[PDB]
From a paper:
Here we employ computational modeling to design scaffolded immunogens that display the spike 815-823 peptide and the stem helix epitopes without the distracting and immunodominant receptor binding domain. Unlike peptide-based immunogens that can sample diverse epitope conformations, epitope scaffolds are meant to present only the antibody-bound conformation of the target epitope on their surface, which typically leads to higher antibody affinity and the elicitation of antibodies specific for the structure of the target epitope.
Here, rather than transplanting only the epitope-specific residues onto a preexisting scaffold backbone which is otherwise unchanged, an entire region of the parent scaffold backbone is replaced with the backbone of the secondary structure containing the desired epitope. This allows the grafting of more complex epitopes that have no existing structural match, such as the CC40.8 S2-helix epitope. Next, we optimized the sequence of the S2hlx-Ex designs using ProteinMPNN21, a recently described deep learning algorithm that takes a protein structure as input and generates amino acid sequences that are predicted to generate the same fold. Nevertheless, given the high affinity of S2hlx-Ex19 for CC40.8 (KD = 6.7 nM), it is likely that the antibody can readily induce the necessary conformation upon binding. Interestingly, the stem helix immunogen S2hlx-Ex19, which bound with affinities for CC40.8 and S2P6 similar to those of the native spike, displays the epitope at the N-terminus of the scaffold.
Residue numbers in the entry: 3 to 131
The structure:
């Protein structure tokens, strides 16, 4: 059934996001802005996303994978936003900012190099707002 596949699609979506949401809550809340870049927590998030994409590619259409990786991107930005305010890191041209910017470029490259995700809107500048 149509009506019902849509309901379960959203159910599996919600749970795929929650699983990543608790990963990020656990890693980003202990993220500290220091070299070496990429940071271990960023790498861990990168390996989870490389793992989940290949596993999701097997079994969902192109459009659904992109929607899930949009939501995970949103969830990551919101978690990183609150950790950066906890630390006092702002977009002020300093080394703490550049370190965050290297980590995030590394992350966005990873996500964009996944098949079907290269055109995702992966801007992050609102994490400072």
């Amino acid at each position: 059934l149509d009506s019902f596949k849509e309901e379960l699609d959203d159910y599996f979506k919600e749970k795929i996001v929650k699983e990543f949401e608790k990963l990020c809550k656990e890693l980003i809340s202990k993220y500290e802005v220091k070299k070496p870049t990429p940071s271990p927590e960023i790498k861990k998030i990168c390996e989870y996303l490389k793992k989940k994409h290949e596993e999701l590619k097997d079994k969902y259409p192109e459009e659904f994978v992109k929607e899930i990786f949009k939501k995970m991107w949103e969830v990551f930005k919101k978690e990183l936003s609150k950790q950066l305010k906890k630390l006092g890191v702002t977009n002020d041209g300093g080394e703490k900012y550049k370190i965050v910017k290297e980590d995030l470029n590394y992350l966005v490259d990873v996500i964009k190099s996944l098949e079907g995700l290269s055109d995702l809107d992966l801007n992050w500048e609102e994490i400072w707002n």
